[PDB]
Amino acid sequence: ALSDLQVFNDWAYKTMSEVLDQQVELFNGATRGAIILRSAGNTGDLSEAAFWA
Amino acid sequence: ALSDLQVFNDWAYKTMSEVLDQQVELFNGATRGAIILRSAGNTGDLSEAAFWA
Numbered sequence: 426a427l428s429d430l431q432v433f434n435d436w437a438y439k440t441m442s443e444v445l446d447q448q449v450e451l452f453n454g455a456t457r458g459a460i461i462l463r464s465a466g467n468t469g470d471l472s473e474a475a476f477w478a
Numbered sequence: 479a480l481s482d483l484q485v486f487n488d489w490a491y492k493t494m495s496e497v498l499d500q501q502v503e504l505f506n507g508a509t510r511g512a513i514i515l516r517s518a519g520n521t522g523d524l525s526e527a528a529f530w531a
Contacts, residue, residue, distance in 0.1 A: 469487030476494035 452462035505515035 467488045469485045472488035474490040474492050476492045476496070478496055 452460050504513050506513075
């Protein structure tokens with residue numbers, strides 16, 4: 426019967442890497458400039474800018 | 479590592495001059511002539527003008 430026969434189950438590897446679910450596209454145009462994301466290099470652990478009060 | 483190294487951070491002198499925040503551009507066309515600004519003035523602490531009734 427089916428018990429006597431060796432039942433080989435089906436299997437596969439879709440190799441899909443589960444990705445982020447949170448919406449994180451909120452930069453520049455997405456926030457019309459509100460979140461300005463640029464690639465500017467700067468030395469030190471901090472950046473300052475003195476301006477008249 | 480970084481502790482041995484010295485950071486100088488970053489600083490600038492933009493000297494941006496903070497200016498008035500209240501909207502005061504309400505003269506001539508801005509108020510449809512209701513509030514008008516005249517560059518020319520008049521002499522004397524007072525400026526009377528006798529017109530017929």
